[PDB]
Write a protein that binds this ligand. Sequence first.
Ligand SMILES: CO[C@H]1/C=C/O[C@@]2(C)Oc3c(C)c(O)c4c(O)c(c(/C=N/N5CCN(C)CC5)c(O)c4c3C2=O)NC(=O)/C(C)=C\C=C\[C@H](C)[C@H](O)[C@@H](C)[C@@H](O)[C@@H](C)[C@H](OC(C)=O)[C@@H]1C
Ligand SMILES: Nc1ncnc2c1ncn2[C@@H]1O[C@H](COP(=O)(O)OP(=O)(O)NP(=O)(O)O)[C@@H](O)[C@H]1O
Ligand SMILES: [Mg+2]
Length: 847
Amino acid sequence: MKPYVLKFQEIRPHSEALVGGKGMNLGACSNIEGVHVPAGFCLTTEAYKRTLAENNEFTQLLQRLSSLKTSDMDAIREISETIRTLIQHTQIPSEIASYMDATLLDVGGYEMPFAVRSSATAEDLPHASFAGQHDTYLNIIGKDALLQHISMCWASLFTERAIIYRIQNQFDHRKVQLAVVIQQMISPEASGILFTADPITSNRKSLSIDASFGLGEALVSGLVSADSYTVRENTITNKIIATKKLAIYSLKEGGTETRILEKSQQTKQTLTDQQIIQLAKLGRKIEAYFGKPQDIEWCLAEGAFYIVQSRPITTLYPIPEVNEPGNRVYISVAHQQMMTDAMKPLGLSFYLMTTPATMYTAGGRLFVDITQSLSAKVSRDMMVNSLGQSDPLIKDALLTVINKKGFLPSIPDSSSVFELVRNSENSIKHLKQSIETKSGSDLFDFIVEDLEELKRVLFNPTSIDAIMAGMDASAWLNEHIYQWLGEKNVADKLSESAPNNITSQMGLELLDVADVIRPYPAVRAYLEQTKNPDFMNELATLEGGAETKKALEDYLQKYGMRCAGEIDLTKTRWIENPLTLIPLILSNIKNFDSSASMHKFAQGEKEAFHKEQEILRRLQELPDGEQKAMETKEKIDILRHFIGYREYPKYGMINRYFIYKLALLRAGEQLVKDGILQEHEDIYFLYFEELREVVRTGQVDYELINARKRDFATFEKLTPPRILTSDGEMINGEYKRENLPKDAILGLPVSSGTVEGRARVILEMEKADLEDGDILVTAYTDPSWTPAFVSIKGLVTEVGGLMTHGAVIAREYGLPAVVGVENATTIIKDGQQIRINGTEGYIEILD
Ligand SMILES: CO[C@H]1/C=C/O[C@@]2(C)Oc3c(C)c(O)c4c(O)c(c(/C=N/N5CCN(C)CC5)c(O)c4c3C2=O)NC(=O)/C(C)=C\C=C\[C@H](C)[C@H](O)[C@@H](C)[C@@H](O)[C@@H](C)[C@H](OC(C)=O)[C@@H]1C
Ligand SMILES: Nc1ncnc2c1ncn2[C@@H]1O[C@H](COP(=O)(O)OP(=O)(O)NP(=O)(O)O)[C@@H](O)[C@H]1O
Ligand SMILES: [Mg+2]
């Protein structure tokens, strides 16, 4: 960390601290044979530190800047003006200028034009991007102009905009410096960007060129327009041709000017087809050198391609680490589970450790690998029809994938259920006791035996037979009563207020806990305005508190394990953060009168005796009439016995998960005491095996954890596709509006009825302030989301499928719901009156 200047040829690996990201990648690119990087050098961060960071006024100014927030806006406008003008007034030490004069003559010389380009780094974050944050000036000639523009580059580190960016991304201003790339200008016929993997599709196999005439500054700042071409294998899939009005050109005596292209020139294809393929190959060599897809800037001059920037890509949805060969197709677990939130590795692993599916992981969520199924004759073709009875877009997405570059070459007893339930209740009772004895590596040793027991109650053949009994029977009823009586999706109304549904009870019991809070206005005022996490220990103060805390405590002992994202072991359970239930307990205090759970439940079973006994009567004057009747009543009794249970096995699974979580946090806090972990919940970023070794060996790799931590962040920003490909193509299916109103948003019908109301688009149940009219539009809706179904008039989600909670819960609440809705939360606007049809599956944006 001594030199002031380095030629691209002199730059060693991992020198970002000295030359910045841009400078480093230019250095790297310049050593690839067949790659022409215009000669140049970096004015090092040394020069920056020497000239500026050693200045007492500068450092004082930056020490001040350290103190302010994005809300200290006018302190930002003025302090940064001071810094900027201070920089442009500070001369560059003659010693630094001397070293530069020498290196500049080597590339050469002060009569030639140079690009002067910012290159930033953040200390100890060598790969941190400052893309589009700081200045570049093109075609600068002469020592005077050079020195002037170096200071200008430096000053551009302290625009209001660059400062705000650093504050929001938690970069310390004192630990960011600017190197300056000084590089021979290319005077090009054409220039542009290259993305080694298509930003649509995201398919890791297509390439993409944006190409314009003239210098690249137009395309990037951000007009002119540009040509777009996609090349899939070595063949060109697509060509696009922009009408390119303007082009930027270098002036002989320095600087730059914009010209208007002749009309007949504006529509010409920037690059020939041969040049496009040549560029693609050029580009494939730099991920191939770099190992991950890349973002590359280029110039075409006199038939020669010049590389002028390269930089890792940052947006694509990762591919599963598959240990299989050949082309693979993955199905998304998120969509069927109604989850789609990124999961942490510890939580990711516990789901994997409990499934007999071939599940893999990509981007913090889970995929199932189902290609070998697809390949065989008549098992594909098993699956596509079968997977189409839960999710049409999946079926659609699979047809679309089997057309590629050869991508492809018993009902149990009535008494069954309560024994199933109590045999789980007890299996958990045992569990709760046996871990409070285990600890350390004994804990881990035990969890694995218990996973076997988890699997045993979860996948009990008798349980499954009881589960399907409900599904199968509403399969039968829906198919057959539409066949005879015609016009019917009947099992929706027949399922209404079904008994023993541990998840429908949950949302409906919160109605009662609010009936307890309602009388006491002391507690209601506290609860109305509180962010205190242990507000439950301040209640005994107020007149209602003691009564209230009891009401709540019992709910949490019944449902406290459950939280949104429950499948992820690492997510805060309700009982760990009771304050998240308050706005729902609050707002259905005000939306309901006394005994609302009774009246909602009753009117449901009333409104399904009527359909039962309407359908049965109405079937009597059909041809074979009282026969057809008795076989349906047979299926209704069956239906309404085993529909509750459909939701129990998840509730048993989770209870274990929360019991495991408590135990694993103990070990993690025990790991803090021993000084081996920094943060007690850092165990969320290790998979369950890695975690075993840590308690076992007393060793961790924090440069690993921190990357898990970092990776997690850049998931969350992702949204899993319905289907994922070995190439990382994403396929969400397309729906079929047969004879549905055009201009409608299409989805899966799931729960019957048409209704009109206010759209409330909510991503957090806690911030959901639902009112009587509202139609809830959200992303997923797992059992966690039930308590919010009691005031709304209809439901809309982005993801899901018939027979997958909480689609199953809408039916029993008698709620119209539509489910497979591409981009509902973005397409629909909060507050827009809206009509949902949950019979035919569509949505109309009412005026
Ligand atoms: C269209 O749905 C199917 C997808 C098929 O395709 C296919 C390739 O894609 C899948 C996706 C996307 C999954 O996410 C998945 C899954 O999460 C899971 C099992 C494991 N399944 N079984 C293996 C055999 N064992 C005897 C029972 C467990 C799976 O196979 C799959 C799965 C597939 O296999 N496991 C679990 O999640 C766990 C840890 C517990 C689940 C418990 C309850 C009990 C389940 O809900 C039961 C009630 C059924 O609901 C499911 C089996 C679905 O079946 C139906 C009719 O809906 C299935 C998601
Ligand atoms: N030597 C060069 N010759 C011709 N055009 C260049 C040269 N260097 C850069 N350009 C163009 O001018 C722009 C300047 O890019 P550069 O400042 O290096 O990064 P940036 O895209 O402006 N922002 P960033 O990448 O985060 O630093 C590029 O987008 C090119 O189109
Ligand atoms: Mg750039």
